[PDB]
Design a protein around this nucleic acid. Structure first.
Lengths: 205, 85, 82, 639
RNA sequence: AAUUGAAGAGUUUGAUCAUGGCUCAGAUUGAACGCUGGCGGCAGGCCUAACACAUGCAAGUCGAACGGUAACAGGAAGAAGCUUGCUUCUUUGCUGACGAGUGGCGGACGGGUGAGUAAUGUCUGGGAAACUGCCUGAUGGAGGGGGAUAACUACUGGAAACGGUAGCUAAUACCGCAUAACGUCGCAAGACCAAAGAGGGGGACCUUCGGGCCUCUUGCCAUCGGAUGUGCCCAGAUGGGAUUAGCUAGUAGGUGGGGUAACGGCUCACCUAGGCGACGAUCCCUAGCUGGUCUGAGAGGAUGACCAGCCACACUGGAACUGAGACACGGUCCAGACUCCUACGGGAGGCAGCAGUGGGGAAUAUUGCACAAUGGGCGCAAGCCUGAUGCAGCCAUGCCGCGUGUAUGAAGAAGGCCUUCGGGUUGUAAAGUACUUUCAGCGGGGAGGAAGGGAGUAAAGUUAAUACCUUUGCUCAUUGACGUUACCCGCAGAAGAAGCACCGGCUAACUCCGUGCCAGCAGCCGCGGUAAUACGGAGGGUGCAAGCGUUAAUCGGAAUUACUGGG
């Protein structure tokens, strides 16, 4: 399932910053970003249309930690929905519990959030949940159980989130780790950098 | 095959015995009638029909005859014995 | 003999009966005249528990359809005064 | 609870299996034929056995006496494929040799007896065929003592006449040396005074557990005298079965057989615990294997059983069952193993009859592999000729009759491949030429093969200077020379070669490693054409051990064999000599020692020394070679 | 709100442009094979031999139909010990009950398989000349007699299987007779047609003390209904082959007789000579059909495994019998092939029921637990029966979820690989440091599937009756195969858990060394004859992930069968 490999090499491959080692400290410069994918990282790729499409899709997947299969499922789920596929895919990827928890600041990186959720520290609507793929319905209330509340890591990990942009589609108690998911996030809120168009393309063929 | 419910076999034979016998006597009275018809003795014909009617209704009531076959015998047989009478 | 009976369907370990009028010789999940409501044993207390279209049932009662024990119990549970 | 296993070492055609049949009769009935002369039931089982006048393999038969189980097997003492009988030693703790009245125990019996001494398990002597002329009433037993090399003493005495004495003895005063070996019996003997026979019987049981000496026996089964009470001795004297049921269950397969209606049956003993019917069980393959069916092989008829008792032996069907496979895991036992002391007892060819039936016949050979563990074969020949590891004269008759029975194929061969190796006669210059005078490829070289000392093998050197040799070019010439070593002009394999490459002209634009590599073989065949060749044959040493009295006569075998005389030495009554004869005639040497020794002969050998030379006419075995490009050019070179 | 939907690429040439095949990118699978493999959830699991099958089980039930009583448990006349009522113990259907037996019902359902079938089937829609056990509505009847036989005893045949003669007996079995109508026939007159009773409780009355009588319950017979189920009929549609053009004599129609529940050449007698066919009859090959499944923008194309309806078959061929319903999977008879038994005289068998075996095959599971739940059979009910069903075992076979740790961590180490030897890269990766415990391991708690049914009690109905009975509340005792359940809590420690394919172009991702048109690779085009980006290894990278590849198969792309949509 999980990637659990060099969570910073991927960031180099995508050339940007997947925030995989977003970590406690801020900006890295501890990996030689951009111009170092690997042994032949100095190469400038000819980069075929397919190339940019695939590259895009992977970037996005590596952001949210979703694998190929589950992803394609999300896609089919986006096509079967109303509105427009582009906004959909990212709204559903945004709906994942590990993602929302991450946004709340409950954990440093996203994988940290995942490891938190999986071990029953997270409790939404009083109903404790393990699955990260759990889609958080609008007007829910995610929190942290008392037996796992303010247990070292979560504290500093939440001190980190103060420098982040912080979503307007969700809120946090900060006083007792009692967050509150609200509306479905608008497209012009998240991303504005990762391109949904190319992803829609890739599965269109 | 070995099966305790094989009583259906011996009983069904013990039944085809009796039932077959009755079916026989019935159809033989009917024959008696048909012969009466062929002879042209409308009187003896009517007689034989009177002699057989109760024994066909009686066997039709016992499920031996479907009381369609009984009405059928009574139908056309009468059409004959009275067409000549 | 027409009879009203639960049809046991749904998932494994998660039974969902569909009360239905059908010939007694018919297979349980087999052929039937018409389904008439449903029973949900593991539903507990929520938005739904057990629907049952009493009109058609009553149509089959005066039609000679023998109600099975469970379905009878349901006819009781939906009551006529509760 | 259970019952101890009993052997049947009827060495030299002792006929002890018939004694097993009569014992099967005495243990009866209550409903049995009682057997008959010859075959005859007696758990003969497979056809071609009783019809052959002797069992082709060891059998099994359930039996009971003295209120206890009494499994027994026979005979496997014939020939000849006796290794399966050695496999039988794992299948039972007990033993019961059938001593001949002819000059004591048979010399063939002595091998199985000494092997029984290797077994570490108890056994008892039996004076079979007591009802016959020339019986050793006081002579053959002495041969039993001189040959046994132990301390066995008769438990009973008899002579006849129509006499059939058994319990009347035995060994008053003089008997009790086995008790003398024990510290306790030695102590009571130190005490002096006469004592009850049971009191020495305890020490006799103690030494008997160690198998310090074989129990006495007498009387012939044919006379129906002593054939019963001796079985009682087999029942009481036999070691108790290790009953338990504590678990966990464990054991191992002893033997398996392919019944025509089987189609297969894997016999196995319960070394510990018990296996419930229709239940999963461990396997040596590390995979689950349910016991779908199993049943005891009763002598009157096979019978099913719901479960096996601990220490019990029983056949069972299975999807798979390798020989000596663990049934636990796992049983832990230590014992020596051997198979007639030979890798192969003179392998013989077995080419199948008919264009297509022989291919099925190889599958029949696989079925032979399914049977007795002591057999092997492989298509080492390029023609895929068979070469059975099976040995002995009568055993070949057994495999052949089995081929004529269960299968529908047969073959007649014995010579096998000569395994000859040609060697160069003398050094000579040669060259493929240069450019294309000529034939493709344009690459060419001046090979210069030279004579080499015998057994030196192929040899070569890169005399050519770089870069004309090429860092990755000359190696193709070497591999090509090896390709030319694959067969000589006579078709014999190359040997003692010394191919020193010299010239190597080539043109760059058209030169390829494959071209020069093709050129090499032409240089090899060319040098071979000028060498004159010389045949070479194997001459493996052949050590032999025969009795000294026949040792002079064995010298007469020397003149009859190509093998040279060699150093040898005496070993007690035994005599030994280090032979050295060619493999081509070595196969008959076993028949020669077998004939001269009167079956007392024994020998061993191993291949060595490729050098030898042979005559006459230098005959060679075709042929090489085909299925490779460039051979047509080689045919062009000849003319 | 409820199909918002259609992509192209490589390869013919020196190059182009067409034409035109081939091939790839997708989805799919009842898949197999190779490598690897931790868990859970829900499904699926002999597509080949309709091959042959050891063994167990898969259909019984009713003592509220009957004579019985072979066991068992209680009761009684009597019996023996001895603590004379404590025990021993023979009779006794007299009760609780229940083998064998008669009778009723079921066994025509449920389960399997798809051989046969090109229409005698199926689907769609109509139709009339029918029947329909059980269930149910309405209206009446339910009077009075007889003769048998199984069991059972006596004897006797047969090795068994399995009887035979002679006696005794019962019924809701069987059978006349009375009895009848809006029932059957007939134009009517008229004629004829049926049956059974059992169980619970009971005041008076009546008792030859067998009980009569009263009442509730149920079953019985007739008719007309209702519902359901089944039979039948027609039209349309439902594979390929014209290198199959003619086929047909019960054949096509008629008339009459028989026959069927019912129409009908369904079957005979005679009469007429017709009937079908180029809008493909006959013959041939293949095929169960359908709802649907897969694919596809759609039209279509392929398929019809699981689920559900229908049809066909039950070792092979044939036949009828019983019954409401079969011309019958675990019935009968007959023949046959094939297995086994035998005392050789004769008998037994039918796994396309569930497991299981051999054989076939690339290939597919336990000789499980239980009737607790749903349904069926029977029964008043209790219960019994149930390989249906519910679960469990098994297999990565598929879909889906999760885990295999997260954060920090430059000396930017060792080793590896590369290099212009300056360095790079593997690499925040590792070790280190700080936390975390899901999931497995271990120990405790613990839902829900259970509704009922039984015992008791009060009430309202029933009724001569505060009795029984039916119904409703109400009390106690309870009913779980799954099941060491789900789920929660606690314990320890990063602790037990990552592979597979690929890296010339198509197609995401490159180098070094080994080999030298050899060894090899290859879906296509092609590489190898030189520091091969194409072979083999290594390093690195990419893809996917408990899987990843390969192969087979269908559709798509393919407007390359074009109806939409071509020449």
């Amino acid at each position: 399932a999980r990637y659990l490999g060099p969570k910073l090499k991927l960031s180099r491959r995508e050339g940007t910053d997947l925030f995989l080692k977003s970590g406690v400290r801020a900006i890295d410069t501890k990996c030689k970003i951009e111009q170092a994918p690997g042994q032949h990282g100095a190469r400038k790729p000819r980069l075929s249309d397919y190339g940019v499409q695939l590259r895009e899709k992977q970037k996005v997947r590596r952001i949210y930690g979703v694998l190929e299969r589950q992803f394609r499922n999300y896609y089919k789920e986006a096509a079967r929905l109303k509105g427009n596929t582009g906004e959909n895919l990212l709204a559903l990827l945004e709906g994942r519990l590990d993602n929302v928890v991450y946004r709340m600041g409950f954990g440093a990186t996203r994988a940290e959030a995942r490891q938190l959720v999986s071990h029953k520290a997270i409790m939404v609507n009083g109903r404790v949940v393990n699955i990260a793929s759990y889609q958080v319905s609008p007007n829910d209330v995610v929190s942290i159980r008392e037996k796992a509340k303010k247990q070292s890591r979560v504290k500093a990990a939440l001190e980190l989130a103060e420098q982040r942009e912080k979503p307007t589609w969700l809120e946090v108690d900060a006083g007792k780790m009692e967050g509150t998911f609200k509306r479905k996030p608008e497209r012009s809120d998240l991303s504005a950098d990762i391109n949904e168009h190319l992803i829609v393309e890739l599965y269109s063929k | 095959n070995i099966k305790s419910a094989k009583k259906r076999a011996i009983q069904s034979e013990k039944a085809r015995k009796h039932n077959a016998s009755r079916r026989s006597m019935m159809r033989t009275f009917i024959k008696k009638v048909y012969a009466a018809i062929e002879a042209g003795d409308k009187a003896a014909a009517q007689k034989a029909f009177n002699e057989m009617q109760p024994i066909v209704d009686r066997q039709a009531a016992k499920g031996l005859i479907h009381k369609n076959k009984a009405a059928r015998h009574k139908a056309n047989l009468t059409a004959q014995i009275n067409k000549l009478a | 003999m027409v009879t009203i009976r639960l049809a046991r369907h749904g998932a494994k370990k998660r039974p969902f009966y569909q009360v239905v009028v059908a010939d007694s010789r018919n297979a349980r999940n087999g052929r039937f005249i018409e389904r008439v409501g449903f029973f949900n044993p593991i539903a507990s207390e929520k938005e739904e528990g057990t629907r049952l279209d009493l009109d058609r049932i009553a149509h089959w009662v005066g039609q000679g359809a023998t109600i099975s024990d469970r379905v009878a119990a349901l006819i009781k549970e939906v009551n006529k005064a509760a | 609870m259970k019952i101890i296993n009993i052997g049947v070492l009827a060495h030299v055609d002792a006929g002890k299996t018939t004694l097993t049949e009569s014992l099967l009769y005495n243990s009866g009935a209550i409903t049995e034929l009682g057997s008959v002369d010859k075959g005859t039931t007696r758990t003969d089982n497979t056809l071609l056995e009783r019809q052959r006048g002797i069992t082709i393999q060891t059998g099994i038969t359930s039996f009971q006496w003295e209120n206890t189980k009494v499994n027994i097997i026979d005979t496997p003492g014939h020939m000849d494929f006796l290794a399966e009988v050695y496999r039988s030693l794992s299948v039972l703790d007990g033993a019961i040799l059938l001593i001949s009245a002819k000059d004591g125990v048979q010399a063939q019996t002595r091998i199985l007896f000494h092997a029984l001494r290797k077994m570490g398990i108890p056994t008892i002597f039996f004076i079979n065929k007591i009802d016959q002329n020339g019986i050793d009433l006081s002579t053959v037993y002495q041969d039993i003592k001189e040959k046994l090399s132990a301390e066995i003493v008769i438990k009973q005495k008899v002579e006849l006449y129509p006499n059939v004495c058994v319990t009347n003895f035995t060994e008053s005063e003089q008997w009790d040396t086995v008790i003398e070996g024990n510290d306790d019996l030695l102590e009571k003997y130190m005490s002096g005074k006469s004592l009850e026979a049971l009191e020495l019987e305890q020490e006799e049981s103690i030494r008997f557990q160690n198998c310090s000496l074989f129990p006495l026996y007498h009387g012939s089964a044919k006379s129906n005298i002593g054939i019963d009470n001796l079985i009682e001795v087999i029942t009481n004297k036999f070691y108790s079965s290790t009953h338990r049921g504590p678990s966990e269950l464990c054991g191992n397969v002893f033997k398996i057989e392919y019944t025509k209606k089987r189609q297969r049956l894997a016999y196995i003993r319960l070394y510990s615990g018990v296996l419930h019917l229709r239940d999963s069980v461990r396997v040596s393959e590390k995979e689950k294997i349910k016991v779908t069916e199993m049943y005891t092989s009763i002598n009157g008829e096979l019978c099913k059983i719901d479960r096996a008792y601990s220490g019990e032996i029983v056949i069972l069907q299975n999807e798979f069952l390798k020989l000596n496979s663990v049934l636990g895991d796992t049983k832990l036992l230590p014992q020596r193993k051997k198979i007639e002391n030979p890798h192969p007892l003179l392998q013989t060819t077995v080419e199948p009859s008919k264009p297509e039936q022989r291919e099925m016949l190889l599958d029949a050979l696989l079925e032979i592999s399914d049977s007795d563990p002591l057999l092997r074969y492989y298509v080492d020949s390029t023609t895929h000729e068979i070469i059975l590891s099976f040995l002995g004269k009568v055993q070949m008759e057994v495999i052949s009759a089995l081929l004529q029975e269960k299968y529908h194929v047969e073959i007649e061969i014995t010579e096998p491949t000569v395994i000859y190796m040609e060697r160069p006669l003398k050094n000579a210059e040669y060259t493929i030429h240069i450019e294309v005078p000529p034939n493709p490829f344009w690459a060419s070289i001046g090979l210069s093969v030279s004579p080499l000392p015998l057994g030196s093998g192929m040899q070569y050197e890169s005399s050519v200077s770089l870069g004309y040799l090429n860092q990755s070019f000359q190696n193709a010439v070497m591999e090509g020379i090896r390709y030319g070593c694959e067969q000589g002009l006579y078709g014999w394999n190359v040997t003692d070669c010394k191919i020193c490459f010299k010239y190597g002209l080539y043109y760059s634009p058209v030169s390829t490693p494959a071209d020069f590599r093709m050129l090499a073989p032409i240089v090899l065949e060319q040098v071979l054409k000028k060498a004159g060749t010389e045949l070479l044959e194997p001459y493996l040493s052949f050590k032999i051990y025969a009795p000294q009295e026949y040792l002079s006569r064995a010298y007469n075998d020397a003149p009859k064999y190509c093998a040279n005389i060699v150093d040898t030495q005496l070993k007690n009554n035994e005599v030994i000599l280090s032979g050295e004869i060619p493999a081509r005639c070595i196969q008959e040497y076993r028949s020669d020692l077998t004939f001269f020794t009167n079956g007392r002969s024994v020998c061993l050998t191993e291949l060595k020394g490729y050098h030898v030379t042979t005559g006459e006419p230098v005959c060679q075995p075709r042929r090489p070679n085909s299925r490779i490009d460039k051979v047509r050019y080689m045919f062009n070179k000849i003319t």
